[PDB]
Amino acid sequence: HKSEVAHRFKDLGEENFKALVLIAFAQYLQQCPFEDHVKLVNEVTEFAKTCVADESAENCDKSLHTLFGDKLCTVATLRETYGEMADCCAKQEPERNECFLQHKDDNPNLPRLVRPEVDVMCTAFHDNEETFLKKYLYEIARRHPYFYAPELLFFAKRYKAAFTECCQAADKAACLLPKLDELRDEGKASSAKQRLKCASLQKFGERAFKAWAVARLSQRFPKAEFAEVSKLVTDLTKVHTECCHGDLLECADDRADLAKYICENQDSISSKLKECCEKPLLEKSHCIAEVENDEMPADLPSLAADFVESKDVCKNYAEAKDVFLGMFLYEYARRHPDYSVVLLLRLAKTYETTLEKCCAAADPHECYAKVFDEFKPLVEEPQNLIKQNCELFEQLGEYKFQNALLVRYTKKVPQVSTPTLVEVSRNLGKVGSKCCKHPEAKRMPCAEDYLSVVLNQLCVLHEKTPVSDRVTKCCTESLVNRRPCFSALEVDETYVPKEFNAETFTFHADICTLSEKERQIKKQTALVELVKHKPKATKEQLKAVMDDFAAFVEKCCKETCFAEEGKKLVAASQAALG
Ligand SMILES: CN(C)c1cccc2c(S(=O)(=O)NCCCCCCCCCCC(=O)O)cccc12
Ligand SMILES: CN(C)c1cccc2c(S(=O)(=O)NCCCCCCCCCCC(=O)O)cccc12
Ligand SMILES: CCCCCCCCCCCCCC(=O)O
Ligand SMILES: CCCCCCCCCCCCCC(=O)O
Numbered sequence: 001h002k003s004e005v006a007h008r009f010k011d012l013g014e015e016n017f018k019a020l021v022l023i024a025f026a027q028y029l030q031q032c033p034f035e036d037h038v039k040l041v042n043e044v045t046e047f048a049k050t051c052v053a054d055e056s057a058e059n060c061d062k063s064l065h066t067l068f069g070d071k072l073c074t075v076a077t078l079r080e081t082y083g084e085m086a087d088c089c090a091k092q093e094p095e096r097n098e099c100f101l102q103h104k105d106d107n108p109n110l111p112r113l114v115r116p117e118v119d120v121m122c123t124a125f126h127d128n129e130e131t132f133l134k135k136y137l138y139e140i141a142r143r144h145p146y147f148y149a150p151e152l153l154f155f156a157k158r159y160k161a162a163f164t165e166c167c168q169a170a171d172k173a174a175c176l177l178p179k180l181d182e183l184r185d186e187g188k189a190s191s192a193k194q195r196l197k198c199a200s201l202q203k204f205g206e207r208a209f210k211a212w213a214v215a216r217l218s219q220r221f222p223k224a225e226f227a228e229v230s231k232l233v234t235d236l237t238k239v240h241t242e243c244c245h246g247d248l249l250e251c252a253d254d255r256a257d258l259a260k261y262i263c264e265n266q267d268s269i270s271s272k273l274k275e276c277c278e279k280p281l282l283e284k285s286h287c288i289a290e291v292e293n294d295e296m297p298a299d300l301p302s303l304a305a306d307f308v309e310s311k312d313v314c315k316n317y318a319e320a321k322d323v324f325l326g327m328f329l330y331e332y333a334r335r336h337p338d339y340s341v342v343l344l345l346r347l348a349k350t351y352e353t354t355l356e357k358c359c360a361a362a363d364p365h366e367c368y369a370k371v372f373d374e375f376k377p378l379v380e381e382p383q384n385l386i387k388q389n390c391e392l393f394e395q396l397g398e399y400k401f402q403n404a405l406l407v408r409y410t411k412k413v414p415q416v417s418t419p420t421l422v423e424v425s426r427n428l429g430k431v432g433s434k435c436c437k438h439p440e441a442k443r444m445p446c447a448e449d450y451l452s453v454v455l456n457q458l459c460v461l462h463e464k465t466p467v468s469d470r471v472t473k474c475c476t477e478s479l480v481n482r483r484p485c486f487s488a489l490e491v492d493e494t495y496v497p498k499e500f501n502a503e504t505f506t507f508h509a510d511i512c513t514l515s516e517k518e519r520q521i522k523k524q525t526a527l528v529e530l531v532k533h534k535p536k537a538t539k540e541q542l543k544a545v546m547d548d549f550a551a552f553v554e555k556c557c558k559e560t561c562f563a564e565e566g567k568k569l570v571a572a573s574q575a576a577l578g
């Protein structure tokens with residue numbers, strides 16, 4: 001294209017472009033003020049408008065990277081503030097940008113963004129929505145460099161959707177909070193998800209990713225033929241590589257390409273994309289990414305024909321082990337959108353293992369005749385965990401369910417820090433709440449997604465804060481071994497009950513009117529340490545100690561009750577629990 005910025009501006013919109021450029025600059029110039037970026041945006045935007053006005057206007061012809069880099073090198077505070085990031089400015093573009101990528105900082109070290117009071121927000125919103133949206137856009141972008149700009153934008157507009165919606169409702173907070181919390185969550189899952197997706201590719205391997213991808217793709221596009229799914233995973237793996245590589249523009253293009261490829265091939269891919277393809281370049285790939293599984297073809301055959309019965313299972317497998325395995329995965333996944341990808345991978349890894357084993361032996365067919373029976377222990381297992389957990393959760397609610405989880409895991413991994421156990425437990429509960437509402441069919445996918453994110457947040461938090469080798473194990477496990485390993489975490493019977501400490505167990509009227517979250521967190525962190533000091537305590541002895549608390553607390557909110565009515569709880573339980 002003549003002038004890529006003219007182009008971009010025109011095929012994005014003034015708005016989207018201002019937002020993206022902001023996000024873009026916010027993401028490198030993470031220690032720069034809002035107004036400086038706004039200045040740059042304005043400086044970039046207006047310039048772009050000249051490039052639009054006339055695609056031949058000086059500097060319009062320049063690469064979106066060059067402009068961007070130049071624009072980055074126009075920031076005066078650039079050497080003082082970004083130090084060596086500024087040295088990038090001396091490098092010629094190909095290197096200049098790759099140098100700016102290097103100097104993007106994932107854990108950039110910023111104040112936690114503190115959700116202001118609704119009214120404050122709702123008013124700042126109403127007054128200067130544009131500034132509102134961008135100022136926070138700014139904060140989230142610089143906090144999340146690497147976080148894919150357009151998506152951030154989509155959260156942005158969803159944030160706008162939540163403010164426009166809630167800032168004119170009877171109870172603003174009753175409306176917004178849940179919504180900002182939804183967005184807060186999904187913003188984190190999405191950030192956590194990207195974090196992961198890039199780590200995934202590197203540690204677990206391009207293979208593992210392609211496998212994961214094929215399974216996903218095939219569940220999402222059952223009626224797509226394997227050659228098609230594979231095309232998509234080859235390209236998806238590429239776009240993915242580039243988005244991880246971090247460069248927004250390349251990445252964005254790659255995803256645009258793919259999305260266009262996928263829209264000019266909806267018939268070959270999915271019938272559920274009509275919606276996703278009528279959308280603008282911007283929303284395309286992301287809509288696509290999020291698209292739901294297409295209906296699988298009416299009455300498909302077992303995989304027994306191609307993977308057991310076929311004469312040439314072994315020949316086909318050996319002639320291209322990974323294509324075949326992908327075909328298995330394809331055929332298995334397409335048939336099972338109900339399975340979590342990793343499951344499919346476990347099944348495929350399994351069918352790979354026996355093929356490896358069998359195809360060598362005198363009679364493979366005999367040997368691998370019952371390979372699918374090996375698939376049941378693997379399918380049911382995580383299927384059971386859904387039934388079981390969604391049962392547990394339906395008999396307990398999000399909250400007491402987290403508490404269920406908390407004691408389960410604190411018992412499983414007592415060394416893990418308590419805030420961690422509280423969060424992963426809390427998030428776990430949340431994913432329980434989220435995926436259990438889902439029907440049996442969509443449950444496992446759903447879980448796996450949140451799960452791998454929860455697990456990964458847990459796992460990387462556990463990295464260089466390590467406390468349980470068994471976790472480091474479950475963390476340094478295979479993409480597919482990860483969750484099982486965890487689900488294989490027993491109670492740490494070598495665990496020495498952490499020595500008692502009254503302070504963690506003394507609470508105050510603080511508790512009675514803390515936000516219902518803080519309440520839960522303090523209760524759950526309490527419940528945790530409770531298990532940490534008394535690992536060996538039956539669901540009998542705990543519903544005991546907890547039903548105490550519950551009573552002990554509402555039968556208190558003259559608040560020195562906590563120092564005394566507390567004292568009793570502290571010693572009563574201590575003795576009761578052996
Ligand atoms: C590349 N990665 C990690 C992926 C992100 C989101 C969805 C993905 C799906 S899917 O079945 O859930 N979605 C349908 C195909 C998505 C094609 C649209 C491109 C969006 C992916 C961009 C995100 C990225 O490449 O990291 C299958 C395979 C990979 C996906
Ligand atoms: C030779 N090359 C480069 C290849 C050609 C064609 C397909 C290929 C696939 S694939 O995604 O299309 N096929 C699915 C991969 C099979 C993986 C099944 C086992 C699960 C992971 C293995 C064990 C582990 O590391 O967790 C993956 C990797 C390489 C492929
Ligand atoms: C500096 C001006 C250009 C800013 C554009 C960078 C972000 C690219 C937006 C195009 C969106 C790609 C499609 C997608 O979301 O997958
Ligand atoms: C406590 C977990 C969330 C509540 C119910 C769903 C989670 C259990 C499902 C485990 C399977 C997820 C990944 C996998 O396929 O192994």
Ligand SMILES: CCCCCCCCCCCCCC(=O)O
Binds near residue numbers: 505523526546573574
């Ligand atoms: C060792 C004796 C001190 C008592 C330990 C208090 C920890 C109990 C946490 C409360 C769990 C939630 C119960 C509820 O839903 O109210």
